[PDB]
Amino acid sequence: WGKDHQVLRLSMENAVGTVCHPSLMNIDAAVGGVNHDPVEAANPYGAYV
Amino acid sequence: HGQDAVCEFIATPVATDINYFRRPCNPRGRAAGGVYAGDKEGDVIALMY
């Protein structure tokens, strides 16, 4: 309800201006910040071509 | 019963949802008053159209 006896609606077409920016594909700092303090051999069956 | 009221008509599409009604809403689908504008003095043709 708005600031009355009034209804309002929030869709997921509402979400157009947030999920569609070209920052969803911006993971540069993520791989770098997790990279230090390494992980041991995780017997890479599905993690290797 | 007294004096008569007069009923007049404006065509509408069938899916102009009823939630816009049940409310003090306006006929011409737009906030049409000269009070609501932002004091630009060319504003209320753009506030109406």
Full DSSP string of chain A: --SSS------SGGGHHHHSSTTTT--HHHHHHHHSS-------STT--
In Å, how far are A28, A47, B26 from B34, measured between CA atoms?
Answer: 52, 67, 14
Residue of A1, A3, A6, A8 best to disrupt the B interface, most CBs of B under 10 A:
A6
**SS3 of residue B6 by DSSP:** coil
- B20 Cα to chain A: minimum distance (Å): 8
Experimental method: cryo-EM
CB B30 within 8 A of CB B36: no
Resolution in Å equals 4.5
CB A5 within 8 A of CB B23: yes
Between chain A and chain B, the number of residue pairs with CB atoms below 8 A apart is 4
DSSP state letter for B44 = H
Rounded-to-integer distance, Cα B37 and Cα B45, Å: 10
Judge whether B17 is closer than 8 Å to chain A, CB to CB. Answer: no
